[PDB]
Design a protein around this ligand. Structure first.
Ligand code: 7WD
Ligand code: YT3
Ligand code: YT3
Lengths: 349, 26
């Protein structure tokens, strides 16, 4: 159904892998389409214009030449509507950047190691989720500069957490990582709702230590799980086994909100099969309305599936691993970022 | 599918919250 044309490409002069890309979905209709890229010690902003034009806006260069940004995520200031960009990577430092000036507003130290992904709560712009090499997830309230909770410990992940996602209403998180597991952490529990409210009321702040998840499975994939997203009440997750698996906790007819923490079953609903994406750390993405699913492979091919029912986007110059993709909010534009620092723009026909 | 109906209604709620917002351009 969906068709795209490659209208432009460029290469960042640092020539290092680009691991993250995100359009700013908070921009109002009528405002310019903006996306950020992250790789090496760099954070770069670009604006999309007519006739495939990619306009460089500003570049953030970390004073630490050894920093390697892995992820970025957009939010806004709850009081002034001002756009904000969070970035993190190998150093395990979260930096809140002002995207209009490209200067860092503040930074958070805490994670014992590298941060693999950042996500903002879909309803509360102040709630930032970080997943780390230290086997834990952390929830921060960036308005009061407090660590709300740490998800890890006794029954937490046993190796690096690679990805996590909030569901559409921000009531729960699914995380995944190097231990091959996918774990559910409910944040609409009376305990978590109160811990969030308390973070707004803030002796130093006492963070919740959540050692036990609400569901756990190691029965979906047989290797590192590097990307997870909610698709309604269902889950989309992938490993390096050349498939995105669509699955759900419990038996076929089990309600996600009735799943007990000891639930032993999983139900597979289907698989999105592809090829040459058998290396670790390759993200898939969806558009805002979750009508499209995109994933790049290790040789520069871009797969796009229609979620309401597969298109393969290739260019002879795009041969490097596509680490992540991002759709514009209206889904008219798809950007792919690569291991060789190249950026590819695909416009919907 | 019933899950698609859940997606539609929940994304519509988020889009309405986005439509009520006027975030400053980058
Ligand atoms: N652990 C580790 N070793 C080496 C790296 N990382 C994690 C890091 C970030 C990452 C994590 C999951 C999926 C990803 C992703 O980048 C693009 O797709 C990339 C490089
Ligand atoms: Y409690
Ligand atoms: Y506990």
């Amino acid at each position: 159904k969906y068709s795209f044309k490659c209208v432009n490409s460029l290469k960042e002069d640092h020539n290092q892998p680009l691991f993250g890309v995100q359009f700013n979905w908070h921009s109002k209709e009528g405002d310019p389409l903006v996306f950020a890229t992250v790789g090496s010690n760099r954070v770069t902003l670009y604006e999309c214009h007519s006739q495939g034009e990619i306009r460089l806006l500003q570049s953030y260069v970390d004073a630490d030449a050894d920093e390697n940004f892995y992820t970025c995520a957009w939010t806004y200031d709850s009081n002034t509507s001002h756009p904000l960009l969070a970035v993190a990577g190998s150093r395990g430092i979260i930096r809140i950047i002002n995207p209009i000036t490209m200067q860092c507003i503040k930074h958070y130290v805490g994670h014992g190691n590298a941060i693999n992904e950042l996500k903002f709560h879909p309803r509360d712009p102040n709630l930032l989720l970080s997943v780390s090499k230290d086997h834990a997830l952390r929830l921060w309230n960036i308005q009061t500069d407090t660590l709300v909770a740490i998800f890890g410990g006794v029954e937490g992940h046993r190796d690096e957490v690679l990805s996590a996602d909030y569901d559409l209403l921000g009531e729960k998180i699914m995380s995944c990582g190097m231990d091959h597991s996918l774990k559910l952490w409910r944040i609409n529990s009376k305990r978590m709702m109160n811990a969030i409210k308390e973070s707004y009321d803030y002796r130093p702040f006492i963070s919740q230590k959540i050692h036990f998840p609400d569901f756990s499975t190691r029965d979906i994939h047989r290797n590192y799980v590097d990307c997870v997203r909610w698709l309604g009440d269902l889950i989309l997750s992938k490993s390096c086994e050349n498939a995105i698996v669509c699955w759900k906790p419990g038996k076929m007819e089990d309600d996600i909100d009735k799943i007990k923490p000891s639930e032993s079953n999983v139900t597979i609903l289907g698989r999105f099969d592809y090829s040459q994406c058998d290396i670790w750390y390759m993200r898939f993405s969806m558009d805002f309305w979750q009508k499209m699913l995109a994933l790049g492979n290790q040789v520069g091919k871009l797969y796009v599936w229609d979620l309401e029912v597969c298109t393969t986007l290739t260019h002879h110059k795009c041969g490097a691993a596509i680490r992540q993709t991002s759709f514009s909010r209206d889904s008219s534009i798809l950007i792919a970022v690569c291991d060789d620092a190249s950026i590819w723009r695909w416009d919907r026909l | 599918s019933s899950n698609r109906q859940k997606i539609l209604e929940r994304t519509e709620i988020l889009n309405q919250e986005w439509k009520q917002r006027r975030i400053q351009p980058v």
